[PDB]
Amino acid sequence: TVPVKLKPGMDGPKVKQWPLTEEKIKALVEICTEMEKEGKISKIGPENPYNTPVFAIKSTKWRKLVDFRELNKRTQDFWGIPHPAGLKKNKSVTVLDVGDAYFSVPLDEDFRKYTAFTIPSINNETPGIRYQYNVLPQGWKGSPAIFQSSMTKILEPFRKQNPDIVIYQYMDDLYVGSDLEIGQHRTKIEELRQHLLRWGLTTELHPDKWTVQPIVLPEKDSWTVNDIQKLVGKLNWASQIYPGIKVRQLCKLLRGTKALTEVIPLTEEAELELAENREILKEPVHGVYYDPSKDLIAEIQKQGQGQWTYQIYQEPFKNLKTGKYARMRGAHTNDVKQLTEAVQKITTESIVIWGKTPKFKLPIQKETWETWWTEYWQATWIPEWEFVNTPPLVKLWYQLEK
Amino acid sequence: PISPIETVPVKLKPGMDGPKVKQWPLTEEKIKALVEICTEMEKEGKISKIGPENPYNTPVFAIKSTKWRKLVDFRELNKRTQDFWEVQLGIPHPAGLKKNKSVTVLDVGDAYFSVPLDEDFRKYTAFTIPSINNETPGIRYQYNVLPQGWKGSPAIFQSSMTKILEPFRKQNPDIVIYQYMDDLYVGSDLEIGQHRTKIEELRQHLLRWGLTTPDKKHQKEPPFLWMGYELHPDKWTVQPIVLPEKDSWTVNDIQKLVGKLNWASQIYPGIKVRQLCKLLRGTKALTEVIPLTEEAELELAENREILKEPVHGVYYDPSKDLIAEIQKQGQGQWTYQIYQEPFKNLKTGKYARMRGAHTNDVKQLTEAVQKITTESIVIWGKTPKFKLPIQKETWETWWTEYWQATWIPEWEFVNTPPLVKLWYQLEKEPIVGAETFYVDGAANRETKLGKAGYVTNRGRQKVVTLTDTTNQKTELQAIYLALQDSGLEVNIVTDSQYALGIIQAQPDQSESELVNQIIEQLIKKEKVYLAWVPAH
């Protein structure tokens, strides 16, 4: 075992366990009695005051999902593999779960305490069941790192055999990228799983298709005072990104106090202005480049009717990427599901593109989100998030996307 | 007979050191009692007489069977001990107890003193018995077991217990043992005699580890007294809450009262404390005597009558449905009852009017649902099917269009008035023909002087000069004018970033009178179309 430590002066996580369902507790209890036996985890005493949250996600088979977000932050660094720029340009990338790989390697006995976690009980009819990892834990940043030599090794043979195929490791995940056609691709992935499987491992993005979508402005036979106002508003706000966007000629048409419903005729100068503004918006703002030393920020607005809009940026109005996400079959009566779904999606894109997860600003109240985000979580990692109050215009502007 | 229980590794906080506080001086009497006690505890094996090889010290005290007892103040040692995983802070709510044929309560007794101290750590617990009136060298000891009052005792004890029971719970899957502080509430569905025997088994399992326990000699008999509750074999009920009648009510008095009444509101239907609370206005001291108004004297009466009602509940049966029903008792106030079979309530409660900056009933309904859900998840590990006084149409129409992620788990409509609705809906498009007010307000934030008028396409005009206003009241006041001064159909355009707010959230209750006034107005119109245009 390699000695690991917490970053200077940082103490261990002491996050509280959120209450779980009976359904979920019985599952964690099962999974944990197993792992206990196999020596992967051991019950612990009260002298260990640390703690991390644990939950169960979805076969009928339930998986254990620990949230080491705090311990990850408190965990020393190790200066992972450099992001492969081409991954983004592949025709198809597959994600495989190699968290099972860690259970092999032991965890520096001195660090264990910090991995303590608790399985709660309905009605507090009992204290929780406490454990701490004896081996590398899935979801801990120091796991894939500490297993890096061992990982590369097991990987080479497959890379050389197929050097037109790229493989990138983020936490427990393996993103495999090629240009082969679907069938030749997937069959070749299984050729990779099989390869992985003869040690102890186990289990469909199209990056080149993710298009950068522009803002399209409304087109009308006739324009009313209202139409022009709304338009002049979107443009105004937008002048914050593209400063060449002008609303003088338009804002002129609006002089006077006439019924919103009245039709205004468009002056030729006004028409150019619009035309000129459609031209400016035809491409993303220039001068936006990714800086690896800065955080990634992912903001989302609920467009309603199951549509969602998002922007990944580091500097306000200097967007790295933007998108919309329309609800998936089945989530009709569920905002929470579409959101967690959108988040997982956006977060994977970010991993694919820059090899790091973005920090999220979510338009949902903390209680609602904390009470139900698990029910639909499906990834091994967990981004960082904060709850916010959607400014009505950033929304209005992006619903204007093509 | 203490314990063959493996000790727990206790260490002192980051790099600190054991206590060294000087022994408080005591009388020959008090001293002679402490000597007595410690001599007993010396033999029970609880403490050990030590010597000069201990710089550590904690102050012992003598307090009064009126017989002399002792008290060691570990305040220091505690603030210098490591931190432990916090012992269970959440307490079971009867409604979450599965009805069992028999239940036994076993308080573990000589709890702490019965469990081993980490032998390393004992030194830190050394205290000293003073000599006759502060003249030199008295008796010195240290603890061999969890000391009463030391920081880790509870957590250490809880653990040891949990460990000792792992086997039993393993071999008796259909037996249920709740753990709470030093108590074991043991319940099963065996037969009165089978049960009785299994309890004696447990008891004997524990004794074989150092934990004495009750016999039918001392061991509580139902109903069980437990936090404002009475636990009967087939129902729980609330223990009588008595409002003392007096002719002199201090501020302290009326507060403690208002408090017991507020707690009562959760269980009893109809409690009210409006006129009571009214008595607190302007009070100059807790001891102040404030004469009860008539209104006050009356509600207090009515409460005395509500309170003498037999509210009771049932226990949880895992095989039946969980159902929570909500009622809106006044703006922002909600009542709920959670049951399985009709009228047979498992739990009830209400949520106080959450006076916000600005919300609407559907939002608050939503929040009461959130609270109930978490409460339920905790208590039963499940989430209720809901019965809500709201039409699925209103819900869909609201949620489906609210800027924020929202949600209600599975629920069904129930028409139990009043119903929660949307007090108004702003128009989706400008209203043809309907007047078009162009509103505005500007106020010297510094002078708090302003005006807020409008000019419609139709000629009608106005402006008012206002005293005491930050542009935000003008703006809103602007809009307010435009609302009163128009027909049941209007189009109002503004530059107010705050009005844009209303647009996206159409609130039906706020902190500010203004917003209220406007809201009132919005509800009166048949159609309103609010529009925002950039300022300048």
Ligand SMILES: Cc1cc(S(N)(=O)=O)ccc1NC(=O)COc1ccc(Cl)cc1C(=O)c1cc(Cl)cc(C#N)c1
């Ligand atoms: C009250 C009662 C009496 C009897 S009998 N027939 O033995 O008198 C049988 C079951 C029950 N109870 C039930 O059916 C449901 O309740 C329970 C179901 C299981 C268990 Cl282990 C305890 C209780 C309790 O009554 C209880 C719970 C706590 Cl947290 C504290 C105290 C406390 N203090 C008592």
